Design a protein around this ligand. Structure first.
Ligand SMILES: [Zn+2]
Length: 226
C-alpha cells in the first residue's frame, strides 16, 4: 500500500496517511532508464497545512497541490524544504505562486542559490549549529549536523511521534550511499546518533526516498555510510 514507482501513474503525486493529521507525499522523476520516487510530509495545524518539501520539480508540485486539495481540502499555507537539492526546493516557485510562505534554513537558501536552484523566501533562524531545534507550527525542525548534505534538516511531529528524516536517512532496502557529491561522510554517523538521541520515541521514520520504517532506519543509515 505505500506508493511506489511501480504503481504511481506517470506524472501523478500520491498521498499516504501516516498518522493523525500527518501524510507523506510521494512523487516520481525518471532519470535515464530508472524511475525514482521521493517523499515529503504534510502536517495539519488547525485548519491549515504545513508542507515539508516540494514534490521534486514544478510539474510535480502543481500536481501535489491539486492532490492535497482533492484528498484533504485544506490550504497549504507554509512550507519547509529540508535541504537545497531539487527534490526539496524544486517547485518552490510553484508554492510561491500558490501563496505559500516558503521556508528553510539560511544555509539551505545559500546552497540553493549557489547551485542555481529555487530558493525558499524565508529563513528559519536559530538553526545554524549542529543540535539546534526550533518549533514551527505542529512540528519541530532539527538541524542534526552534516550528512547527505551540509544543511540537511529533519522534521518531527511530536503529537504522533513521526520523524521525517529526508535524505539523511536511507530506506531499509538501500545498501549504497548514493549521491555523495554534497555529503559529509565523516560527519554522517555523528549526525545519525544525534537524531537517535533526540527522538528516541519516534514510531515512524520516513526516508527521503523509499519506504517508511521505524527507528531501525537510523542505524541502517550509519551502516550503509561507514
Ligand atoms: Zn539531496
Amino acid at each position: 500500500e505505500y506508493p511506489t514507482v511501480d504503481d504511481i501513474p506517470v506524472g501523478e503525486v500520491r498521498l499516504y496517511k501516516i498518522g493523525d493529521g500527518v501524510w507523506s507525499h510521494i512523487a516520481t522523476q525518471k532519470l535515464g532508464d530508472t524511475v525514482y520516487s521521493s517523499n515529503g510530509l504534510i502536517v495539519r495545524d488547525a485548519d491549515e497545512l504545513l508542507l515539508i518539501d516540494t514534490a521534486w520539480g514544478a510539474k510535480n508540485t502543481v500536481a501535489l497541490l491539486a492532490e492535497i486539495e482533492k484528498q484533504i481540502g485544506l490550504p497549504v499555507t507554509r512550507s519547509i524544504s529540508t535541504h537545497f537539492h531539487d527534490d526539496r526546493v524544486g517547485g518552490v516557485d510553484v508554492l510561491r505562486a500558490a501563496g505559500v510562505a516558503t521556508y528553510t534554513s539560511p544555509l539551505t537558501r545559500q546552497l540553493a542559490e549557489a547551485a542555481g536552484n529555487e530558493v525558499p523566501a524565508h529563513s528559519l533562524k536559530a538553526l545554524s549549529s549542529s543540535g539546534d531545534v526550533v518549533r514551527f507550527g505542529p512540528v519541530e525542525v532539527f538541524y542534526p549536523g552534516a550528512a547527505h548534505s551540509g544543511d540537511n534538516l529533519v522534521v518531527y511531529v511530536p503529537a504522533v511521534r513521526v520523524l521525517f528524516g529526508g535524505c539523511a536517512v536511507h530506506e531499509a532496502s538501500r545498501e549504497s550511499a548514493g549521491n555523495v557529491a554534497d555529503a559529509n561522510l565523516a560527519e554522517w554517523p555523528a549526525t545519525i546518533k544525534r537524531i537517535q538521541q533526540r527522538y528516541p520515541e519516534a514510531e515512524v521514520v520516513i526516508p527521503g526516498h523509499g519506504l517508511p520504517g521505524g527507528l531501525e532506519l537510523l542505524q541502517h543509515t550509519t551502516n550503509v555510510v561507514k
